[PDB]
Every structure is written in C-alpha cells, then in structure tokens.
Design a protein around this ligand. Structure first.
Ligand SMILES: [Zn+2]
Length: 606
C-alpha cells in the first residue's frame, strides 16, 4: 500500500518490536551495532521478507543463533536498497520470529546529522542528532520504513564517557561500558507502539533541569538555564492537553533545545520534544509554539497516517488541537487569530506552488515523488481548514472536540487512511448526515488550489494590526509626528509580529518613517526572534545602514533557515552591505550548519 517503501507490507508481516544495540563513533561518524526485529507473520508459508536499507553495510543476519542468507537489491534513488532475508523455516499465521541484523551506518547517511564542535555552543565536544521523518529511518537501521507499521522498542547506546545519549523513550539506566572504560551505556524503553520515523537519537554534551513533575529540559551548559526559564509553563500546557484529549499516555515529556546552529523547526518525537533555540525570547512570549508538538502526543503520534499520501491526517488534527490549547491560554478570538494566520500561510503556499499543482491537494500521490521535496504547509493548514469548516458546520467547538476524542480513542496506537477517517466521521455524526452530504468531498480532499469554501474567522485582533500597519503605510512626513508609543497599549507580541508582517508586505518605506518607528516603538530592544526578524528586514530593505550590524549579528547568531537565509538574501540585495555580508559569511560559515552554509553561499554566489 505504501509507495515510499520497498519492504514487506503490513499485510504480510508486521514488526512488533525493535531491540537496538549500538555504539557512536564520532571519528568515523558511524553507528555500528545490531538491530533485533520481532516479526509477526500474517499468513501461512512465509519463507522470506524484505526490509528497507539506505547506505547500510550489512555484516550478517542471525536467526536463532545461526547466520541466514540475504541479498541487497539495487538502490532506487531516495527509496534506498531493498534487503531480502531468507527465513530458515516457513512461518504460520501469527508465528513470531526474531531477526538480528549486524549493521553500520554511512557517514553521509541522510538520517544522522553530525555537528563539529565549532557548530555547537560549547565549541568543545561534537554533537549528533537524528532526523528520521519521513522515510529516512532506513538510513539508520534495517526495518520496515512506513507509518503503517508501529512497534515498541528498547535501545542501548554506547557513547564516549563525557557525553550523554537521549532517545525518544523513557530513560532507564546508565552504566559504564563493560568492555570500554572510556565509554558509557545508556538504556531506553519505549512501551507505546510508534512508527519507525519517530525513533530519535541525540548524543552530545547535555545537562538537565527539572521544570515540572514529568518534565526535564535538556541542552548544553550555555542554553539550559535560559530554556528552563522560558519553558517553565510546559506543565500547565500539558494539563490543558489532558483537559482536551484525556490523560497523557507516554508517561514522560522532556524537551531538548538543539544548538543555535539548528536550521529546522521543532520535532514531535515521543517523550523527547526537540525545540529550536529561536524560541528563547527571554519573556516566554514564544513558548506557546511548543503547544504544537504537545498536541502530537494526543493526536497524530497516537493516530498515524497509514501512508505519506495521508500525511494531512497527522498534522491537521494536531493543528486543530494545538489551536485549542492556545485557545484556552489567550482566549477564543486568539484561537481565531492563529486560524486566520494559518489560512494566510495556506494562501502563500498555494500561490507559490500554483493553484494547479498536485502538492496542493489534501491527499497527494507520492508514488515517484520524494516525500521531502513535496513537503509544505498544505497538509497542515488545509487539513485544519477542513476540520474548522466541519466544526462550524456540525454545531460547534465542543461537539467537534467530542468527535476528536472519539477519533483518538478509537484509532489510538494504529494507522488509518483518509477513507477510514471519513467513515468514522459519518459514523459519529450519523444524526447530522444531512449536513455532511452537503460538503464537497472530491474538492476538499482531491482538488488542488484553495478549498472551495472559507471558514468564518473573528477579525478583531487582526483588525487592530491592519489598522496600525495601514496607518504607517499611508503616513506622510507631516503625519510622522502624531505617532506615539501608546499605539502598542493593547497589542500582543503575536499582534506586533503580524503588524510588522503586514507592514513589511508592502516593500521599502521612507527611511525617516522607520527611523521614527524606532524612535517611538523601540523595536531594536526586543529580542523576540520573529518580531526582530521582520523588523530588521523592514530596516534593511528600507536602506537604513544603522541596521547593517544588527541584521548581520542575528543572521549568524541563530541557524534557523527561515531567519538566516532571508536575512542574508536582503543583506546581499542591499548594495551598501553586500560585500560585508559576503565576507561575514566567509567568516562564520565553518560554524554554520553544513546545509545552511552551502545554501547561504549559493544565495551569495560564492
Ligand atoms: Zn507537526
């Protein structure tokens, strides 16, 4: 059923368990060890099975203390090489077997990012972190790579003594390596079944702070004390999640703040949530962002898309829940605020892709397509748009939350397609079918472009933003004096961010306009990364030279691509700062993430 996997489908055999034993070598950049897969045959007379491998060197395959025979098919592009394992004895229905595979990862493996010490905070020890999503788990260990298969797993990781290993799991024990006194062994147990793309690993110099009963925050000695402050409210958000979707079933929720070099956004990995450093503003104003990954534990980690075509099932419901979390934090019209923002992001994604492009469909077809090339915000905000539309159509947020609960409770720890979700939607709402039959299903699910209808959003918190932004865009030299510092009296940090987003939408402003904006609003003082980003772009595109240093510092102070790359783009496009931005790139590129380096360097034409 899954077009992105070469392994045996879940209809033949299913992996129920993974016991991982491995060691981390930072000199060779390799994970060497053994992956022991418990396989349950779903049919009689099963003599062989296939697994996904990508750039893996296979030593041997042991079944019941004896080496079996295997063959590695040819690599197909991003899909990798299939691995055929010949079973010694035929398997009956439900007969279970344990296949142990001795494997070593490649240094160029796409699932594992190795960071040099200069690319970390401490500038002393190296770093390692995994990105499995979507299909990259096959580049770590042989497995069935597909969300349609869920498995519990236990792992034992050997790392240099001075470092620490975390995974997505409950930490069990720590013991000095029996055969290597210079190394340590860390143990992990994941009791809840998960797809293999939620297996995560981090190895580096890490400390911890306990910010809640079940919550530790992990990071390097530089960042732990700040993250402990910013994220102190995560326990209350967790309790909100339990209020909406019921008790937390994964048993521990930790947080790992990646080095400042981390280019991407947060990851939902179970029991350990990755956090981007850009979220530390010092005021806790961006902490609510975390509410996304939290909701993943209640929606989409429990109920998983059966194939990646169905990815919307995962994120969409997740988003729907997260905006309810924020809904109770800042109020309802704020939930509407982030809703309208999400619709805006959908607009930009569609017009950038084009309204005819297949990747704008809610259920895509990934057959020959790389899952990471087609990735966009469509399955997030279009899915949320559908569920919000059905919320307002089916009688309200309370009712549709009831639906959400029934959905999770029914499909928890399983995988489903879109048709399954729609079947259960008609089953739950069966009194209301008359309404449901007026939805256009072919258009919403399978048709590109924007959805055929739009939900009704509350405009107040947005209308303030547009009011001020327009005031500045329409301002004339005579007007600039009337502006006062009180204009921000009622606005949130989120509203200020939207204000600078709308004001930046409109292209350069008279230099004196933004110089005044700095005088009254003192935007230079706020360290919030979103607002500071849009503010510094507003300054640089407006030909203000005083912002050159600031725009530069931020560009190299954080590694997030959504920030770094546009800042270097503008600093290059500004003819006054171009040279300086080039040589600054040449200066800091060694400490940049390897991807952001060549990417910003190609943008700078080096
Ligand atoms: Zn997500």
């Amino acid at each position: 059923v899954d077009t992105c996997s070469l392994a045996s489908p879940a209809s033949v055999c299913r992996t129920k368990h993974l016991h991982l034993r491995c060691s981390v070598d930072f000199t060779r950049r390799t994970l060497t060890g053994t992956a022991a897969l418990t396989v349950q045959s779903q049919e009689d007379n099963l003599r062989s099975l296939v697994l996904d491998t990508k750039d893996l060197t296979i030593e041997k395959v042991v079944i019941n203390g004896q080496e079996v025979k295997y063959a590695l098919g040819e690599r197909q592009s991003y899909k990798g090489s299939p691995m055929e394992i010949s079973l010694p004895i035929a398997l009956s229905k439900n007969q279970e077997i344990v296949i142990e595979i001795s494997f070593e990862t490649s240094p160029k493996s796409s699932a594992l990012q190795w960071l040099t010490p200069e690319q970390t905070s401490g500038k002393e020890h190296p770093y390692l972190f995994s990105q499995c999503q979507a299909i990259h788990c096959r580049a770590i260990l042989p497995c069935q790579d597909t969300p349609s298969v869920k498995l519990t797993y236990t792992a034992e990781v050997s790392v240099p003594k001075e470092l620490v290993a975390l995974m997505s799991a409950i930490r069990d024990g720590e013991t000095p390596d029996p055969e290597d006194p210079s190394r340590k062994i860390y143990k992990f147990i994941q009791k809840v079944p998960i797809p293999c793309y939620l297996i995560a690993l981090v190895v580096g110099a890490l400390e911890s702070r306990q910010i809640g009963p079940r919550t530790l925050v992990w990071s390097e000695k530089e960042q732990v004390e700040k993250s402990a402050y910013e994220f102190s409210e995560t326990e209350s958000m967790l309790k909100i999640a339990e209020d909406l979707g019921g008790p937390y079933v994964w048993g521990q929720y930790d947080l790992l703040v990646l080095p400042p070099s981390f280019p991407y956004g947060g990851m939902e990995n179970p029991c350990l949530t990755f956090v981007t450093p850009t979220l530390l503003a010092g005021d806790k104003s961006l902490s609510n962002v975390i509410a996304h990954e939290i909701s993943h534990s209640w929606t989409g980690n429990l109920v998983t898309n059966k194939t990646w075509d169905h990815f919307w099932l995962n994120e969409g419901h997740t988003v729907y829940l997260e905006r309810h979390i924020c809904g109770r934090l800042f109020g309802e019209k704020f939930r509407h605020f982030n809703a309208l923002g999400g619709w805006g992001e959908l607009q930009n994604s569609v017009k950038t892709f084009g309204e005819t492009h297949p990747f704008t469909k809610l259920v895509v077809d990934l057959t020959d397509i790389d899952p990471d090339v087609a990735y966009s915000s469509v399955p997030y905000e279009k899915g949320f748009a559908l569920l919000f539309y059905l919320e307002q159509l089916l009688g309200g947020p309370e009712i549709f939350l009831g639906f959400l609960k029934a959905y999770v409770e029914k499909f928890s720890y399983k995988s489903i397609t879109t048709d399954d979700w729609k079947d259960f939607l008609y089953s739950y709402f069966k009194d209301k079918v008359d309404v449901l039959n007026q939805v256009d299903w072919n258009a919403w699910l399978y048709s590109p472009g924007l959805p055929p209808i739009k939900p009704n959003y509350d405009m107040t918190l947005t209308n303030a933003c547009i009011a001020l932004s327009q005031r500045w865009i329409t301002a004339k030299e005579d007007d600039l004096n009337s502006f006062n510092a009180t204009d921000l009296k009622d606005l949130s940090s989120h509203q200020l961010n939207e204000f600078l987003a709308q004001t930046l939408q409109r292209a350069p402003l008279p230099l004196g306009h933004i110089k005044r904006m700095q005088e009254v609003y003192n935007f230079n003082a706020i360290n919030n990364s979103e607002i500071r980003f849009r503010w510094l772009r507003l300054c640089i595109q407006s030909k203000w030279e005083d912002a050159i240093p600031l725009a530069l510092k931020m560009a190299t102070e954080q590694g997030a691509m959504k920030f770094t790359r546009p800042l270097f783009k503008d600093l290059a496009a500004f003819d006054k700062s171009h040279d300086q931005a080039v040589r600054t790139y040449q200066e800091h590129k060694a400490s940049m993430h390897p991807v952001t380096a060549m990417l910003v360097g190609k943008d700078l034409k080096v």
